[PDB]
Chain A
Amino acid sequence: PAPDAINDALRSADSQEARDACQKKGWIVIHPSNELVVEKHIS
């Protein structure tokens, strides 16, 4: 399935169930939060 379609499909009907289903099938892949750099700034 094309990424265009995965995207347009999830947007159309979005739920935790659909996320998990897509994830189980390898269509979407969760980016672990521990790998994400977080910055802080005070205005």
Chain B
Amino acid sequence: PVIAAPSMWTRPQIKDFKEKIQQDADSVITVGRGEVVTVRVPTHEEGSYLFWEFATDNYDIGFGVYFEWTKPLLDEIVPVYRRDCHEEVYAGSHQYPGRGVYLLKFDNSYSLWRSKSVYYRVYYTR
């Protein structure tokens, strides 16, 4: 199973991103104290690349990406690491290794006293 390296980057405008994402209730997730939230994104029948964007309001949150092949095989696309996404919008992409499901990991586990608000968005190509 050859697996392409992901791309990751950031872009400066956080305020505009959040204002745009807030327009959809389901695109804003509350990650509780010590909670890990997993957003599952399936590979698309016509699809090659997946895109993700996310931001938090105040505090950093853990972010990583795993791929679930269709007990099951789990590959690490993006290691989970705390991100500055409260300061800037964090984005990234990956080429489809095969048929399966992407797990977007928002990891608050290290946070004892603080919930996090996660604004996020997902695209894909053809």
Chain A positions near chain B (C-beta within 8 angstroms): 3-4, 6-7, 10-11, 14-16, 19, 23, 26-34, 36-43
For the complex, give the distance between the alpha carbons of A40 and B29 in Å: 11
Interchain CB contact under 8 A, B34 and A43 = yes
Is the C-beta of B48 less than 8 angstroms from some C-beta in chain A?
Answer: yes
Chain B residues bordering chain A, tally (CB within 8 A):
35
CB-defined A-B contacts under 8 Å, sample of 29: A3-B48, A3-B125, A3-B126, A6-B49, A7-B51, A14-B91, A16-B17, A23-B123, A26-B126, A28-B51, A28-B125, A29-B124, A29-B125, A30-B122, A31-B122, A31-B124, A33-B27, A36-B26, A36-B40, A38-B29, A38-B38, A39-B38, A40-B35, A40-B37, A40-B38, A42-B32, A42-B34, A42-B36, A43-B35
Question: Nearest-CB distance from A34 to chain B (Å)?
Answer: 5
Interchain CB contact under 8 A, B32 and A28 = no
Which one of A7, A32, A33 lies within 8 Å of B93 (CB-CB)? Answer: A7
Interchain CB contact under 8 A, B7 and A29 = no
> Which secondary structure dominates where chain A touches chain B?
mixed
Is the C-beta of B65 less than 8 angstroms from some C-beta in chain A?
Answer: no
Chain B positions near chain A (C-beta within 8 angstroms): 7, 9, 11, 13, 16-17, 20, 24, 26-27, 29, 32, 34-41, 44, 48-49, 51, 91, 93, 95, 109, 120-126
